[PDB]
CSV table of C-alpha atoms and ligand atoms in Angstrom, one decimal:
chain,number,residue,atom,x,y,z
A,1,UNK,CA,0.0,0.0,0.0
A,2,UNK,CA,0.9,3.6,-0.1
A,3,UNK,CA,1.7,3.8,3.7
A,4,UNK,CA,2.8,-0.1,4.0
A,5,UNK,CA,5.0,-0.2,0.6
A,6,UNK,CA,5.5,-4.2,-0.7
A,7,UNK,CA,9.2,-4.5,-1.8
A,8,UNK,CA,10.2,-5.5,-5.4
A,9,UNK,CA,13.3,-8.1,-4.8
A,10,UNK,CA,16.4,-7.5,-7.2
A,11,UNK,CA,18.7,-9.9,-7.7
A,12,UNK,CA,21.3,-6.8,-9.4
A,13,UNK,CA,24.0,-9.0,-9.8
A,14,UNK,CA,25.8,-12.6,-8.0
A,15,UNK,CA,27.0,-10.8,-4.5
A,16,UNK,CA,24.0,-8.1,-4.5
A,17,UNK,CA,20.6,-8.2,-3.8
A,18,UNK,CA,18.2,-5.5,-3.3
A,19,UNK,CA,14.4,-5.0,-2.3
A,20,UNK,CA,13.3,-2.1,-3.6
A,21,UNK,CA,10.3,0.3,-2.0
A,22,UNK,CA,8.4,3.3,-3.4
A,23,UNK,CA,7.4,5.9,-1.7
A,24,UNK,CA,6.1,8.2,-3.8
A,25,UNK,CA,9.1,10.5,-5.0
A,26,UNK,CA,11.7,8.7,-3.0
A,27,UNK,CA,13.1,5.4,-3.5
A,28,UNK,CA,14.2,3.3,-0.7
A,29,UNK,CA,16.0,-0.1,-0.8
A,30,UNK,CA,17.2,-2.5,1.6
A,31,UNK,CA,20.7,-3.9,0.2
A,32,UNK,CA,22.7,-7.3,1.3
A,33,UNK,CA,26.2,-7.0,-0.5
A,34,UNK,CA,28.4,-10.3,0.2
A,35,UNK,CA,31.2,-10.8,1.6
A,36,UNK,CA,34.4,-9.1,0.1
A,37,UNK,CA,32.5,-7.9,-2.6
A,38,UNK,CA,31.3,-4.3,-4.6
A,39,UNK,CA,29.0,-2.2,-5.9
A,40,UNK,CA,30.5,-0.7,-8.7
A,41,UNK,CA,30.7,3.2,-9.1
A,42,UNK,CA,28.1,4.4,-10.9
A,43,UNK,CA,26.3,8.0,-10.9
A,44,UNK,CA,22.5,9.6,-11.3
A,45,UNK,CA,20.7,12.1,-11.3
A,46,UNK,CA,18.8,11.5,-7.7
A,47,UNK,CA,20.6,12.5,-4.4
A,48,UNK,CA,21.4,9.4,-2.6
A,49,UNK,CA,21.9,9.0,0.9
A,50,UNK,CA,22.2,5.3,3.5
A,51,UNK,CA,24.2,3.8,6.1
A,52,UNK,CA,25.2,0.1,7.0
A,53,UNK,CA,22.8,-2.0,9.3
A,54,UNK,CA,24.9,-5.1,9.9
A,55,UNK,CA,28.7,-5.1,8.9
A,56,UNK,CA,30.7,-2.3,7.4
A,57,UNK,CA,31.4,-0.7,3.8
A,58,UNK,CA,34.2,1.6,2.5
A,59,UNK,CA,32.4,4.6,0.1
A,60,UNK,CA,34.4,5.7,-2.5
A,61,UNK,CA,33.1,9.1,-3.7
A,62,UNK,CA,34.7,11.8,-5.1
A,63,UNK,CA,38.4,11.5,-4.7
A,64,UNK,CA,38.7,9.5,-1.7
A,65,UNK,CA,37.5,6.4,0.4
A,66,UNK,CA,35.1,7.1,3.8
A,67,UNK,CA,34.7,4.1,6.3
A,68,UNK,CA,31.1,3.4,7.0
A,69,UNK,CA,30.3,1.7,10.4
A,70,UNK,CA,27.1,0.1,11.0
A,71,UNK,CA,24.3,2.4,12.7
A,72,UNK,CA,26.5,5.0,13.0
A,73,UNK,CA,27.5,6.6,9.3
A,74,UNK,CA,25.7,8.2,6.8
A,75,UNK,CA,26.8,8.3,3.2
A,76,UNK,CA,25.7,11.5,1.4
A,77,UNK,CA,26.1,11.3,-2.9
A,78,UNK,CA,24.3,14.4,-4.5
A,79,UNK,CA,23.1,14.4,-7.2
A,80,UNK,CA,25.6,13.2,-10.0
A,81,UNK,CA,28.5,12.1,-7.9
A,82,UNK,CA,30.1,9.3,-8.9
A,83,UNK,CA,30.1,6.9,-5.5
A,84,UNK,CA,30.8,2.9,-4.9
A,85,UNK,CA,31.1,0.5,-2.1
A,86,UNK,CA,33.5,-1.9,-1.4
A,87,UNK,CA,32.4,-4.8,1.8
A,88,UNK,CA,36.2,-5.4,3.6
A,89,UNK,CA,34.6,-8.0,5.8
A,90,UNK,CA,33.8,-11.6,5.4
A,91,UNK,CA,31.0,-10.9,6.6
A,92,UNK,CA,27.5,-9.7,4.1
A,93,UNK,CA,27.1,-6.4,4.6
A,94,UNK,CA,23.3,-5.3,5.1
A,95,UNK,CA,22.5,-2.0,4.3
A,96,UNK,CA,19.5,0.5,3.0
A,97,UNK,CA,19.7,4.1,1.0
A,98,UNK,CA,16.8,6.4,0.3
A,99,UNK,CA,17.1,7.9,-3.6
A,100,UNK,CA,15.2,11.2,-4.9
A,101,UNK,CA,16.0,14.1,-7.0
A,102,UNK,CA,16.2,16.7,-4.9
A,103,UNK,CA,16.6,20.2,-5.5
A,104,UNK,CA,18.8,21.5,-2.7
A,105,UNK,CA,22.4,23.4,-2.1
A,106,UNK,CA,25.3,21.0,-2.3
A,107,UNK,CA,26.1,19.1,0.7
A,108,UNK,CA,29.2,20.2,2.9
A,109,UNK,CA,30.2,16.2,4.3
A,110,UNK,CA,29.8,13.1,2.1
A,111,UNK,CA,29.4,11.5,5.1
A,112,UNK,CA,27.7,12.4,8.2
A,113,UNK,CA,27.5,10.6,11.7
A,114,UNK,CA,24.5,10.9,14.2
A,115,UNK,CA,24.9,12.2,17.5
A,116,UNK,CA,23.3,12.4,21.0
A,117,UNK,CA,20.2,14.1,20.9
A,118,UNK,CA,16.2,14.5,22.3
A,119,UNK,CA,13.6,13.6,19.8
A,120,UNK,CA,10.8,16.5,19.9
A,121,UNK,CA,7.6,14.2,19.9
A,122,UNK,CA,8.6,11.5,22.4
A,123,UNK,CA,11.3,13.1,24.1
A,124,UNK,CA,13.2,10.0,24.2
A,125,UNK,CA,16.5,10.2,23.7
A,126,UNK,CA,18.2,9.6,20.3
A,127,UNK,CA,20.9,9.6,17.6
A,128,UNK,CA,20.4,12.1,14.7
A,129,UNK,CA,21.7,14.0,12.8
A,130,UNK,CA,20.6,16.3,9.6
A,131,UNK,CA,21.8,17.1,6.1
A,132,UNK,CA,20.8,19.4,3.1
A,133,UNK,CA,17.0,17.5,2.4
A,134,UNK,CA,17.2,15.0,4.9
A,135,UNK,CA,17.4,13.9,8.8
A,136,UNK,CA,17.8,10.9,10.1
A,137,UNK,CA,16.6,9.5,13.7
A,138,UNK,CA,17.1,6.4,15.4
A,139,UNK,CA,15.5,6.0,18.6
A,140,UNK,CA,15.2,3.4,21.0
A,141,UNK,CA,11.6,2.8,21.7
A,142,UNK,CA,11.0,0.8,24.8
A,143,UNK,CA,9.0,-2.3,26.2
A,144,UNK,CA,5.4,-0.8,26.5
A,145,UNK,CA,6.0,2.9,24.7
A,146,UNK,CA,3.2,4.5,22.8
A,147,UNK,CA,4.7,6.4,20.1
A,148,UNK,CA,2.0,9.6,20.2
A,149,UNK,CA,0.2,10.9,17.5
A,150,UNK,CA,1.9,13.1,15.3
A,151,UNK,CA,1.3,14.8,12.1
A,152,UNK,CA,4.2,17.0,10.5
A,153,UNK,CA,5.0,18.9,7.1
A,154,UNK,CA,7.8,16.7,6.1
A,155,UNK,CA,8.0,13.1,4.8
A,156,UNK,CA,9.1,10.2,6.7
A,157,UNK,CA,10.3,6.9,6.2
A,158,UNK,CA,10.8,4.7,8.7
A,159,UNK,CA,11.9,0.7,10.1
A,160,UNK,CA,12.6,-1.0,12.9
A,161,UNK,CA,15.7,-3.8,13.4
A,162,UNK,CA,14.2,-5.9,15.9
A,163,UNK,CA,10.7,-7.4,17.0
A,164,UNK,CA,7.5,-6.4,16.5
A,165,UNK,CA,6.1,-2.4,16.5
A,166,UNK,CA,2.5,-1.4,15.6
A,167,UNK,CA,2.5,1.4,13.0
A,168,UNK,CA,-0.7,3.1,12.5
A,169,UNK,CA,-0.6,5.7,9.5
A,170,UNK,CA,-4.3,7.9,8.7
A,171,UNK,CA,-6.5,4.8,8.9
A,172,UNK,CA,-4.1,1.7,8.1
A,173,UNK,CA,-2.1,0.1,11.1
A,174,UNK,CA,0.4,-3.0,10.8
A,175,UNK,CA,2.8,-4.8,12.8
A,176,UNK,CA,6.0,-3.8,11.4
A,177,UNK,CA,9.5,-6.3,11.8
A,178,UNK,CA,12.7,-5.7,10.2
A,179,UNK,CA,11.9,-6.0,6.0
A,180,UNK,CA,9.3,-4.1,5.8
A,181,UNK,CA,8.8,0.1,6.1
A,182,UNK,CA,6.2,2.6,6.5
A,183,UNK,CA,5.7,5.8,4.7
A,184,UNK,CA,4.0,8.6,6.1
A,185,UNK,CA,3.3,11.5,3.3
A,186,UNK,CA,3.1,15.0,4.6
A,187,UNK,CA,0.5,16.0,6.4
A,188,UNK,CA,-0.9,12.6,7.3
A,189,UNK,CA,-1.2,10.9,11.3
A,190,UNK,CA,1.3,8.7,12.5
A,191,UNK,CA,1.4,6.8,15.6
A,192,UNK,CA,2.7,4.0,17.2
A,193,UNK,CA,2.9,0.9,20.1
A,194,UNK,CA,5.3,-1.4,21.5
A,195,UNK,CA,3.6,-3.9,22.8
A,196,UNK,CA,6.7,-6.6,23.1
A,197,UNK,CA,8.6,-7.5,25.9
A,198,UNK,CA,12.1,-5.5,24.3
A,199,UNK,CA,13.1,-2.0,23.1
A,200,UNK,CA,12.7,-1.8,19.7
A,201,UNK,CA,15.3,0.4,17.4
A,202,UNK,CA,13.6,2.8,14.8
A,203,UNK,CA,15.1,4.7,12.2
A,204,UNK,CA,13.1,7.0,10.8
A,205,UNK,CA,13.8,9.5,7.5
A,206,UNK,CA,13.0,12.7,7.5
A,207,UNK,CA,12.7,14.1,3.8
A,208,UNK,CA,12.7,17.9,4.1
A,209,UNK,CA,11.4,17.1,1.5
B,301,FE2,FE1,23.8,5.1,-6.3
């Protein structure tokens, strides 16, 4: 649906496979790159911007090479730039990026890192940090939380890494695990409940946009 987007699997090539989401002018992806292995440089007109989930990737982009950590590092491509990926582990790497033509001022960092900060709905405490049309959040939510309604002028993506969290979104709700996302257009109500026994871990996208 628009709110709870069905992935289109991609098998783009022997050590890379995709599942691909729309959401309306963004495209977002969920990627599993084996071990030792690349994704080629490449370029294209849409701003790109991801991080690592599980494992750890070196971004070549421009003239150098950027270490990417897992839940930590955000790669930032605008739009254009030639950028690739090598895994250096022998280990898959599991990773997602968010693509959309964008019309903003160039970025200053082609990578960014999220830091310790308060999340204005919740108040919970988080790791964020913000770019030129983006910001992204990941939040712990715990055992119990009710994620309050919310309704805000920018876009949002979001996932979870772990269990189980109920996602309601205008009139549609689903339990949400790690795989699938939710989409929340502008404008529309979002709200939320962990009703498992653990804290959850969100990541949400902001699209600013
Ligand atoms: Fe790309």
């Amino acid at each position: 649906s628009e709110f709870f987007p069905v992935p289109k699997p991609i098998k783009l090539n022997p050590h890379v496979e995709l599942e691909v989401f729309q959401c309306q002018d963004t495209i977002f992806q969920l990627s599993v790159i084996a071990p030792n292995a690349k994704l080629e440089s490449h370029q294209h007109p849409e701003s790109q911007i991801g991080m690592v989930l599980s494992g750890e990737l070196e971004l070549y982009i421009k003239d150098v090479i950027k270490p990417l950590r897992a839940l930590q590092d955000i790669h930032v491509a605008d739009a254009n730039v030639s950028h690739g990926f090598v895994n250096p582990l022998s280990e898959p790497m599991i990773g997602f990026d968010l693509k959309r033509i964008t019309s903003s001022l160039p970025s200053e960092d082609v990578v960014l890192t999220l830091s310790n900060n308060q999340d204005k709905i919740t108040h919970l405490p988080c790791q964020s940090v913000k770019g030129s049309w983006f910001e992204i959040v990941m939040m712990k939510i715990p055992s119990g939380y009710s994620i309050p309604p919310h309704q805000g002028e920018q876009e949002e993506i979001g996932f979870i890494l772990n269990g189980k969290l109920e996602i309601f979104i205008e009139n549609e709700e689903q339990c949400l695990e790690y795989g699938q996302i939710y989409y929340a257009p502008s404008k529309v109500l979002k709200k939320g409940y962990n009703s498992s026994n653990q804290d959850i871990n969100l990541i949400k996208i902001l699209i600013l946009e």
